[PDB]
PDB file of N, CA and C in Angstrom:
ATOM      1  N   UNK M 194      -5.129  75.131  46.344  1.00 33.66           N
ATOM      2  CA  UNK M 194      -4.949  76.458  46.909  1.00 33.66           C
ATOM      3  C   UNK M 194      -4.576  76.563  48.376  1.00 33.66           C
ATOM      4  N   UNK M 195      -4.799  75.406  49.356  1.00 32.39           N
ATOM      5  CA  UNK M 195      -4.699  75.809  50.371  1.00 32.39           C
ATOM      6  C   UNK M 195      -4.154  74.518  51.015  1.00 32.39           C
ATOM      7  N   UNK M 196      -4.003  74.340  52.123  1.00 30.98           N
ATOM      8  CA  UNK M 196      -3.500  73.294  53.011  1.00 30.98           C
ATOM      9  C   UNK M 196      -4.072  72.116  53.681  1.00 30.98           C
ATOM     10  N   UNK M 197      -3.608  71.049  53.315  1.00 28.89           N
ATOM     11  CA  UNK M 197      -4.850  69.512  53.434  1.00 28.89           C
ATOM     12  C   UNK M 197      -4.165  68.904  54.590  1.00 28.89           C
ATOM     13  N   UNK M 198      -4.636  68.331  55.925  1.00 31.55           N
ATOM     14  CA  UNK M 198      -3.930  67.683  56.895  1.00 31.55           C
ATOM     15  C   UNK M 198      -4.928  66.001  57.362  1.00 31.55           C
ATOM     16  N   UNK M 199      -3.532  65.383  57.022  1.00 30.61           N
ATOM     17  CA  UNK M 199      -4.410  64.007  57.516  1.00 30.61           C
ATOM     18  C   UNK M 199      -3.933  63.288  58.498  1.00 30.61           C
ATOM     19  N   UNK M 200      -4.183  62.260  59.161  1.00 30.84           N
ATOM     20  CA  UNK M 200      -3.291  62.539  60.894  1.00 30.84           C
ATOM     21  C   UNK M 200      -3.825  60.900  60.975  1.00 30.84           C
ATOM     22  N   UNK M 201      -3.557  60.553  62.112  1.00 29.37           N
ATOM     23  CA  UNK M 201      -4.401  59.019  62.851  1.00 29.37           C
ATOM     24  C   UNK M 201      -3.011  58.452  63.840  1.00 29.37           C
ATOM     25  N   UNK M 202      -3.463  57.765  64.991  1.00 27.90           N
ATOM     26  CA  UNK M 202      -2.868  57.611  66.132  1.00 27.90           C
ATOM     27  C   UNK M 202      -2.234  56.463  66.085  1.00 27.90           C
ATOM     28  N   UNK M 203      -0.791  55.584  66.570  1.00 28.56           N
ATOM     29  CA  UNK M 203      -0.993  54.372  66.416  1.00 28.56           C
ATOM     30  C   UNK M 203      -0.660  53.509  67.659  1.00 28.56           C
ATOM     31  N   UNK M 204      -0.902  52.227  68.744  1.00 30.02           N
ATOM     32  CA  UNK M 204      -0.702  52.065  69.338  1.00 30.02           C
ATOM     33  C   UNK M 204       0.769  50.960  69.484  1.00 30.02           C
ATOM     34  N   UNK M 205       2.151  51.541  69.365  1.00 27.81           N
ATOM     35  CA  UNK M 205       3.569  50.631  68.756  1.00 27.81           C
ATOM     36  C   UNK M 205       3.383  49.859  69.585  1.00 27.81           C
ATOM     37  N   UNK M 206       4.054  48.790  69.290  1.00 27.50           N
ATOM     38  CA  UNK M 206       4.582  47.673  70.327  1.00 27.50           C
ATOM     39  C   UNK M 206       5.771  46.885  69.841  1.00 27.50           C
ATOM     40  N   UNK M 207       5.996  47.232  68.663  1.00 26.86           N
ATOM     41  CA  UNK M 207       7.632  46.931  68.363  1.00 26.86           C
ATOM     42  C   UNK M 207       8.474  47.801  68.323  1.00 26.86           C
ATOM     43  N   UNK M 208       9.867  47.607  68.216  1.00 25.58           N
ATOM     44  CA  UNK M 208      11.159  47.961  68.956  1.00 25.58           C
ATOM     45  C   UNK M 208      11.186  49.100  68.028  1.00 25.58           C
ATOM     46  N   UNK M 209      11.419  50.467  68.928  1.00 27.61           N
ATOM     47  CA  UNK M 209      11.653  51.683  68.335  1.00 27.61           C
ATOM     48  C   UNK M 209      12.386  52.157  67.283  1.00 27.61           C
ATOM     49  N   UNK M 210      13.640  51.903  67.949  1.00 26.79           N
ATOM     50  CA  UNK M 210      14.621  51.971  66.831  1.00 26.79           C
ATOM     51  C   UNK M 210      15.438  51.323  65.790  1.00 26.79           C
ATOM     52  N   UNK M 211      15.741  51.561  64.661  1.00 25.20           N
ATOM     53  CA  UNK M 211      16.286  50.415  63.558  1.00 25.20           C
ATOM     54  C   UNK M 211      14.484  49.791  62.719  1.00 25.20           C
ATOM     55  N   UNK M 212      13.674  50.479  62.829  1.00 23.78           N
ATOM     56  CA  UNK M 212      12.832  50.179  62.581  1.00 23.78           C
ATOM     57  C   UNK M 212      11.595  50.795  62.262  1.00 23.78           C
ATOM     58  N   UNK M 213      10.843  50.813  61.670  1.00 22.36           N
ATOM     59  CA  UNK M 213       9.237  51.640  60.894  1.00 22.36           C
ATOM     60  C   UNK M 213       8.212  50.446  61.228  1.00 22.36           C
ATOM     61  N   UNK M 214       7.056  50.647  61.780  1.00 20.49           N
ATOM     62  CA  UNK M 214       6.378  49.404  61.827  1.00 20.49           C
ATOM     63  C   UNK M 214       5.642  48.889  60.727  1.00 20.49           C
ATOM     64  N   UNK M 215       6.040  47.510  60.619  1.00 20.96           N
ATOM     65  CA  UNK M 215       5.280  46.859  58.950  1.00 20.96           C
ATOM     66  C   UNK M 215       3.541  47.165  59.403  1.00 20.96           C
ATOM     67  N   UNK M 216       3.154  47.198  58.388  1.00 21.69           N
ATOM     68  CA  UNK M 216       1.549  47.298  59.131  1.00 21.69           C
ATOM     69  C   UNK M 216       0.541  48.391  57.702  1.00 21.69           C
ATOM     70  N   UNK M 217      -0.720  48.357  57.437  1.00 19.25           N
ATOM     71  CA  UNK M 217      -1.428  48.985  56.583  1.00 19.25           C
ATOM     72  C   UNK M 217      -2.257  49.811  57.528  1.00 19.25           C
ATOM     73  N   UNK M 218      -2.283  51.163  57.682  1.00 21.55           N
ATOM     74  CA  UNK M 218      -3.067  52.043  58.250  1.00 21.55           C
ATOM     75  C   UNK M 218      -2.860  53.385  57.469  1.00 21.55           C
ATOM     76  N   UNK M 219      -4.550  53.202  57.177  1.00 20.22           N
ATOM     77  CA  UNK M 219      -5.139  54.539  56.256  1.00 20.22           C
ATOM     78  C   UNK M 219      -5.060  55.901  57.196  1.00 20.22           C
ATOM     79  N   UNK M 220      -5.072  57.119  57.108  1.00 21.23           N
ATOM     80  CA  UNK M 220      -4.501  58.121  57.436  1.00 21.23           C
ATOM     81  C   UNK M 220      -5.929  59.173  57.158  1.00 21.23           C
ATOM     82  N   UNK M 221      -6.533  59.247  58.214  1.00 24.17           N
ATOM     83  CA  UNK M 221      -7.985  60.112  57.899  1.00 24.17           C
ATOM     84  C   UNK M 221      -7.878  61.726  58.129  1.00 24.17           C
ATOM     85  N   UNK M 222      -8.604  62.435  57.029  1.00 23.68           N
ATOM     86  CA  UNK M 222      -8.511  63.507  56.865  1.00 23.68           C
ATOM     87  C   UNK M 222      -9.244  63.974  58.439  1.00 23.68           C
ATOM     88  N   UNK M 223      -8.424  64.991  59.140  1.00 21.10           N
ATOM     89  CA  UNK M 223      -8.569  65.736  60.276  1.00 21.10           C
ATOM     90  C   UNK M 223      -9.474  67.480  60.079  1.00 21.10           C
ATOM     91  N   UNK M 224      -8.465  68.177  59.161  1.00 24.99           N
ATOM     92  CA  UNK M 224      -8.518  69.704  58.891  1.00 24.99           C
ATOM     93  C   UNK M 224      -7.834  70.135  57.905  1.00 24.99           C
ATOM     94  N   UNK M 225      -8.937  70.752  57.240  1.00 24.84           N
ATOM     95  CA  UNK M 225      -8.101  71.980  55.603  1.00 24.84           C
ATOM     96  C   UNK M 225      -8.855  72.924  55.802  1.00 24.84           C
ATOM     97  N   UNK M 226      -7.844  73.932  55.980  1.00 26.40           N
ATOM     98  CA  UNK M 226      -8.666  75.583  56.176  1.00 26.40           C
ATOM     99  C   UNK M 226      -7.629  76.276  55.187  1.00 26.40           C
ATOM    100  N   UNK M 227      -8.855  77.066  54.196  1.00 27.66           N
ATOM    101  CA  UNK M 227      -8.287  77.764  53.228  1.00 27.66           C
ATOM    102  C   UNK M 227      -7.738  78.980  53.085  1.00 27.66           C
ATOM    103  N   UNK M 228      -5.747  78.317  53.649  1.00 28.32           N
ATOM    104  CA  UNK M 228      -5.020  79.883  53.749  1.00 28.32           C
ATOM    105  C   UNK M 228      -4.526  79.787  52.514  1.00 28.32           C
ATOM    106  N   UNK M 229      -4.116  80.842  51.686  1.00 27.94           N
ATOM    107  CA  UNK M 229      -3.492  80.817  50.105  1.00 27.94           C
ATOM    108  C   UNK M 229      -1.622  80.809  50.551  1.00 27.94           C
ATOM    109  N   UNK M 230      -0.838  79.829  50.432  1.00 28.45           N
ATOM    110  CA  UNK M 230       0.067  79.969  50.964  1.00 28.45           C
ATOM    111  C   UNK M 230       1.489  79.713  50.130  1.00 28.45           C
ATOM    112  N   UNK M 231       2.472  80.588  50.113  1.00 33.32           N
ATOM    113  CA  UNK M 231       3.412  79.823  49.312  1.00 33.32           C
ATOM    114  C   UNK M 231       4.287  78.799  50.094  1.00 33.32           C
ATOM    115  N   UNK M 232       4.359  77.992  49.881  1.00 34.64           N
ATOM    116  CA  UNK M 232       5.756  76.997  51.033  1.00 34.64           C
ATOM    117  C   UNK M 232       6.635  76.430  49.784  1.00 34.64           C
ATOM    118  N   UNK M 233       7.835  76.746  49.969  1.00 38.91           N
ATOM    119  CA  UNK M 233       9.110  76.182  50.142  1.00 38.91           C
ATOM    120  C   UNK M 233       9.784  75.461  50.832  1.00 38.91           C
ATOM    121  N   UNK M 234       9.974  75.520  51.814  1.00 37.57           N
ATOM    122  CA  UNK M 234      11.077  74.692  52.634  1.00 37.57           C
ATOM    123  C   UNK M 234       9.800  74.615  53.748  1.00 37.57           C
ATOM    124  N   UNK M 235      10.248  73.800  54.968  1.00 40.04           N
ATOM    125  CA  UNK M 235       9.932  73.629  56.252  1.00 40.04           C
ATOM    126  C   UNK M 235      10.878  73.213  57.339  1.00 40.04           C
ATOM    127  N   UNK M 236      10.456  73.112  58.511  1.00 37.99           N
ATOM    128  CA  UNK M 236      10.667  73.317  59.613  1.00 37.99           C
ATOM    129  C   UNK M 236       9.995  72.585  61.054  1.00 37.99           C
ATOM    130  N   UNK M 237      11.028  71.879  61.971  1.00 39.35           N
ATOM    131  CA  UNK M 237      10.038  70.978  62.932  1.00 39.35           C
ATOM    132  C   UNK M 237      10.302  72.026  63.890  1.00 39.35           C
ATOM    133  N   UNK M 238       9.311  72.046  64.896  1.00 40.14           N
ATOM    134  CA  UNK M 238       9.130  72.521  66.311  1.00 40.14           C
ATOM    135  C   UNK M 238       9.651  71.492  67.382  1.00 40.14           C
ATOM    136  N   UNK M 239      10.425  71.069  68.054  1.00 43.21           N
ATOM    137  CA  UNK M 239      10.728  70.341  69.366  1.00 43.21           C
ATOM    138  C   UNK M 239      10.596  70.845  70.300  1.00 43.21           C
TER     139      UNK M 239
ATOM    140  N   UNK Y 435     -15.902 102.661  38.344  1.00 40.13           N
ATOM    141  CA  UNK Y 435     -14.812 103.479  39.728  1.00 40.13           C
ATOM    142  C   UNK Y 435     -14.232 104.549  38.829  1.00 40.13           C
ATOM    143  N   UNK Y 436     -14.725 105.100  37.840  1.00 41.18           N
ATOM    144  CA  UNK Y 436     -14.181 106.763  37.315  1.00 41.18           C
ATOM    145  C   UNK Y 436     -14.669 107.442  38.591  1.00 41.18           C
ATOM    146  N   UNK Y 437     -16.188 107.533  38.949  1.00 42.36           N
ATOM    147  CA  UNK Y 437     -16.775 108.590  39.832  1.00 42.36           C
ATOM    148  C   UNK Y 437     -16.620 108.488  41.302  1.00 42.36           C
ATOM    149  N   UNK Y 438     -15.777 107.193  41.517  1.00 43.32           N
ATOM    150  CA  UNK Y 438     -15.980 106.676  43.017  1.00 43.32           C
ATOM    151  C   UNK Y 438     -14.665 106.741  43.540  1.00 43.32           C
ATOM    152  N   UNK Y 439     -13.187 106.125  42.761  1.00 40.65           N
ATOM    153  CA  UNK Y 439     -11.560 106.181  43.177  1.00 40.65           C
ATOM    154  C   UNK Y 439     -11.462 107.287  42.610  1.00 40.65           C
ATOM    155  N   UNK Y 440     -11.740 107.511  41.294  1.00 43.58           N
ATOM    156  CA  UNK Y 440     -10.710 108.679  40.269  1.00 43.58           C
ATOM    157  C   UNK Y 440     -11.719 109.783  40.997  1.00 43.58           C
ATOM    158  N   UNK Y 441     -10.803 110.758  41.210  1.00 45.48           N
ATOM    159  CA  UNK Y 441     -11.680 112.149  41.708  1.00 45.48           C
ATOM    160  C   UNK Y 441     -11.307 113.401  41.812  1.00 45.48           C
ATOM    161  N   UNK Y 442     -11.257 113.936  42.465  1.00 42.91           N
ATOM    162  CA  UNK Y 442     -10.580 115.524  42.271  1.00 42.91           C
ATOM    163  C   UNK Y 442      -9.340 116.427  42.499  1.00 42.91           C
ATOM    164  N   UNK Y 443      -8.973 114.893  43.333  1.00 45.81           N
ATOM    165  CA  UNK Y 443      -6.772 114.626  44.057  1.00 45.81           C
ATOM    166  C   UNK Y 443      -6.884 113.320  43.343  1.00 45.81           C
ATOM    167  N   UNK Y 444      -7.190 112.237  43.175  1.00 43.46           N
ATOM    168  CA  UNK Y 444      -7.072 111.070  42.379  1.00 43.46           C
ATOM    169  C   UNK Y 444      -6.180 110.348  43.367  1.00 43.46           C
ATOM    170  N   UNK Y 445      -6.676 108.976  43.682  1.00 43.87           N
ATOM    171  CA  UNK Y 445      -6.048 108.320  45.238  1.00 43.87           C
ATOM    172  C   UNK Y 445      -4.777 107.478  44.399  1.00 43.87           C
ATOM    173  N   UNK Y 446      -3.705 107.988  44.551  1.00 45.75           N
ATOM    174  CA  UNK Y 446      -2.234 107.240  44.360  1.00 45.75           C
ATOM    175  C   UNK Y 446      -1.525 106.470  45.075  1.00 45.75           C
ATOM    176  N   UNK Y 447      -2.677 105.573  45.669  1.00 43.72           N
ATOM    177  CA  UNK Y 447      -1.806 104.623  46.596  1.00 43.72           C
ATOM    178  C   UNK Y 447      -2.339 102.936  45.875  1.00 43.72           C
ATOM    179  N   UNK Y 448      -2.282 102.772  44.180  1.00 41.16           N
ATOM    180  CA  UNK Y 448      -2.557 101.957  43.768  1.00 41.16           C
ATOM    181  C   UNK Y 448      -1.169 101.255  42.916  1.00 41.16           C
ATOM    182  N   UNK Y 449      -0.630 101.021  43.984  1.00 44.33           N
ATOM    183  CA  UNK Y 449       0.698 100.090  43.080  1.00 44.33           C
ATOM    184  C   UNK Y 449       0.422  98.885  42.258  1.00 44.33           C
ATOM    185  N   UNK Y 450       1.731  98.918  41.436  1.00 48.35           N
ATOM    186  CA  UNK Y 450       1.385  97.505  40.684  1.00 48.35           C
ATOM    187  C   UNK Y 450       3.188  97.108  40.131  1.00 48.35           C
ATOM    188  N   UNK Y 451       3.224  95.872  40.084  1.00 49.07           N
ATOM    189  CA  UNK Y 451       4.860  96.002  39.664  1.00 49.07           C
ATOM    190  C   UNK Y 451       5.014  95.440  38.399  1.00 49.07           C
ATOM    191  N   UNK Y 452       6.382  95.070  37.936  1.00 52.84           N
ATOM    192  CA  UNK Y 452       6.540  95.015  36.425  1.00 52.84           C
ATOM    193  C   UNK Y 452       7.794  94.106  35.723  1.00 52.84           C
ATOM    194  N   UNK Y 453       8.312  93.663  36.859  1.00 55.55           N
ATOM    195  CA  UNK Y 453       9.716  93.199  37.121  1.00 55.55           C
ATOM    196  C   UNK Y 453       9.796  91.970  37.995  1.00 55.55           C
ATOM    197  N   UNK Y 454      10.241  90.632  37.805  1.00 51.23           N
ATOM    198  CA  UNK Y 454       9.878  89.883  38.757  1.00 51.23           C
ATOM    199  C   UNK Y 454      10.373  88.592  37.847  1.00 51.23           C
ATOM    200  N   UNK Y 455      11.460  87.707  38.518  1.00 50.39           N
ATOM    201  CA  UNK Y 455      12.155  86.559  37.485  1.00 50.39           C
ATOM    202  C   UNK Y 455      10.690  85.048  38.135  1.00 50.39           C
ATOM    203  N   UNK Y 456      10.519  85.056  39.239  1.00 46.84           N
ATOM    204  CA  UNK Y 456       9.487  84.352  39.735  1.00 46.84           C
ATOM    205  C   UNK Y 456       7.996  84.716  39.335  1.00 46.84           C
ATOM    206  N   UNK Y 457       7.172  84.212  38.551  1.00 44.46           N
ATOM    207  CA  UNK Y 457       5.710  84.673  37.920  1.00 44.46           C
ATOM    208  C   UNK Y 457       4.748  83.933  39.243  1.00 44.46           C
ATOM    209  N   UNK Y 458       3.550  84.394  38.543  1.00 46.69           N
ATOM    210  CA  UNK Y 458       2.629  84.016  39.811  1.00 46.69           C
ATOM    211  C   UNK Y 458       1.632  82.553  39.395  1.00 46.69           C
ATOM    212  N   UNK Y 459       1.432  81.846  40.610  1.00 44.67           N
ATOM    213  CA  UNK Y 459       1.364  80.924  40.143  1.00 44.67           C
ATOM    214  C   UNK Y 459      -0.618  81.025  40.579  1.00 44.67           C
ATOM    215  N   UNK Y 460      -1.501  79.895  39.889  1.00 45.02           N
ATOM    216  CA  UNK Y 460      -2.788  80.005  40.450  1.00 45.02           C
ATOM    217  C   UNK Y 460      -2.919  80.217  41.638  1.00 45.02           C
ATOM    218  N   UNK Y 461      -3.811  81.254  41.622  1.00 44.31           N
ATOM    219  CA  UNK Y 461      -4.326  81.935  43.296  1.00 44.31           C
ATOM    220  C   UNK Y 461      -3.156  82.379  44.008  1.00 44.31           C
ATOM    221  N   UNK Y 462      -1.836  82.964  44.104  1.00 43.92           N
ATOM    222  CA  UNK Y 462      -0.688  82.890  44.763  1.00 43.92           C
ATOM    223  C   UNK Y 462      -0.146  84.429  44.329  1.00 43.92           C
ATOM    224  N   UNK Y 463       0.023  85.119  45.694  1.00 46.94           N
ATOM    225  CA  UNK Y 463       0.800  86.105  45.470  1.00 46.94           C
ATOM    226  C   UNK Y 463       1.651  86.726  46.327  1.00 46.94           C
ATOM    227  N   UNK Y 464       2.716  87.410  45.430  1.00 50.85           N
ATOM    228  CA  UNK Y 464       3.942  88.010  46.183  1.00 50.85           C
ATOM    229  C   UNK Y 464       3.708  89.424  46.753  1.00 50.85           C
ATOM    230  N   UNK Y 465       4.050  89.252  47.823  1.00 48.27           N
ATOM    231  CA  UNK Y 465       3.677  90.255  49.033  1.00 48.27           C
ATOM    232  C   UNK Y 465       4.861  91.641  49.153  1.00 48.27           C
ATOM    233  N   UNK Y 466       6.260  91.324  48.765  1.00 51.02           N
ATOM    234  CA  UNK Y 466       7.249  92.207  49.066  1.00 51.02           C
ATOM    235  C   UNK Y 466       8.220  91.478  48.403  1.00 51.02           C
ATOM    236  N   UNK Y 467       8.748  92.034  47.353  1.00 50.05           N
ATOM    237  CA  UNK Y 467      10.017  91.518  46.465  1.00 50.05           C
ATOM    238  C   UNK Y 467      11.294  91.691  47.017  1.00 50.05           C
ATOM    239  N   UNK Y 468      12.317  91.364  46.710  1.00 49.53           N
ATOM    240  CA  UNK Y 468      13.846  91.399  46.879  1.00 49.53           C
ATOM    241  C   UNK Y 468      14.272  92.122  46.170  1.00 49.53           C
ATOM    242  N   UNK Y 469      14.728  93.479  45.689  1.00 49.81           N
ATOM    243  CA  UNK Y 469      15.747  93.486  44.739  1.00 49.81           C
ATOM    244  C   UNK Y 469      16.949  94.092  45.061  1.00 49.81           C
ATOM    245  N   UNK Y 470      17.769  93.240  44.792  1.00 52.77           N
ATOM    246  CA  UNK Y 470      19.304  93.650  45.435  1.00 52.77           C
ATOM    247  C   UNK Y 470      20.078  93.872  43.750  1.00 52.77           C
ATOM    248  N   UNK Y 471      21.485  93.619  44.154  1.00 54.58           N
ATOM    249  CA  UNK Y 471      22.226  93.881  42.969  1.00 54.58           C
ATOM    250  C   UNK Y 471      22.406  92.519  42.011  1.00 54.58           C
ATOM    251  N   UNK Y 472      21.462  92.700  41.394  1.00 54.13           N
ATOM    252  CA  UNK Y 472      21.093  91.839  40.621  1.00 54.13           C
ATOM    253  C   UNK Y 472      22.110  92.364  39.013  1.00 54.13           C
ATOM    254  N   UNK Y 473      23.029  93.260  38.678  1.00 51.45           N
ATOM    255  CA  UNK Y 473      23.330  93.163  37.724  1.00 51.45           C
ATOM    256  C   UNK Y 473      25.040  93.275  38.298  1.00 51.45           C
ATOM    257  N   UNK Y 474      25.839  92.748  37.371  1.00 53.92           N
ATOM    258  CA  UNK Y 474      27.258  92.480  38.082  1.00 53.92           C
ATOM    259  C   UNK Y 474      28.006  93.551  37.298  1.00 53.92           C
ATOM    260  N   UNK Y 475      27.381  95.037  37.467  1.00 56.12           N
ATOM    261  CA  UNK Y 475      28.689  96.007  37.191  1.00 56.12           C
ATOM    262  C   UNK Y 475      29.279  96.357  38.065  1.00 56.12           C
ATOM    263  N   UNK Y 476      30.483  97.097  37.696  1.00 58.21           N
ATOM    264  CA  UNK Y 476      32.058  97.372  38.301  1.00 58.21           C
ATOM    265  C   UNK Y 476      31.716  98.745  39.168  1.00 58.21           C
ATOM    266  N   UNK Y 477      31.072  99.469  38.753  1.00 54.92           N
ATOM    267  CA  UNK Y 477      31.260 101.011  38.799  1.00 54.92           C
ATOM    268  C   UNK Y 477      29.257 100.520  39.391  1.00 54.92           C
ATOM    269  N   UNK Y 478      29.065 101.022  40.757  1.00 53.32           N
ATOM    270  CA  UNK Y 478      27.757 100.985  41.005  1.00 53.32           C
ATOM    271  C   UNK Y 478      27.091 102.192  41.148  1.00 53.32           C
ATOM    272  N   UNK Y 479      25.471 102.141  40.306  1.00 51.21           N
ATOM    273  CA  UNK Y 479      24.848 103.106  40.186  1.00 51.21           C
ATOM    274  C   UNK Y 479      25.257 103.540  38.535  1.00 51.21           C
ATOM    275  N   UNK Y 480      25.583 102.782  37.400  1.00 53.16           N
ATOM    276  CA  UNK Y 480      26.088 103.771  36.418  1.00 53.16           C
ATOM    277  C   UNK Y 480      24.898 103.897  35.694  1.00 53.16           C
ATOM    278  N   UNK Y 481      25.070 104.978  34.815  1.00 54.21           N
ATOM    279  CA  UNK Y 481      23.582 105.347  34.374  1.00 54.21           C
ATOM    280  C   UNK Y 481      23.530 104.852  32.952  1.00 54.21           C
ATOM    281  N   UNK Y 482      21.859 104.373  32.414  1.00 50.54           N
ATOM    282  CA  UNK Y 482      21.030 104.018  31.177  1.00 50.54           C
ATOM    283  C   UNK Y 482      20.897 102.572  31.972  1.00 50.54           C
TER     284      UNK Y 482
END
């Protein structure tokens, strides 16, 4: 029903671009507050 | 709610709609519909 957010920080040290860092890191639940929402599409903020 | 809404002017601000190609899904609802010209006649506004 509502919106689940899971987040965690990472400290890079390999080369930015041309690249995703190999590596296993679990992703801990932060905040879910129960708005009833429809989503379709999205959208980034810069 | 006979003795409490229904009353002696009867409160008519209880909409409900009837028409809608998108259904509702668990817990989820539509707030303000679209309806444009959804049928492709020639002559607009014709009647039945």
């Amino acid at each position: 029903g509502y919106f689940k957010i899971y987040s965690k920080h990472t400290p890079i040290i390999v080369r930015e671009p041309e690249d995703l860092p190999q590596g296993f890191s679990a992703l801990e639940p932060l905040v879910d507050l129960p708005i009833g929402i429809n989503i379709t599409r999205f959208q980034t903020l810069l | 709610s006979n003795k409490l809404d229904s009353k002696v002017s009867g409160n008519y601000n209880y909409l409900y709609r009837l028409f809608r190609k998108s259904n509702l899904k668990p817990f989820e609802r539509d707030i303000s519909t679209e309806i444009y010209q959804a049928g492709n006649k020639p002559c607009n506004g014709v009647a039945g």
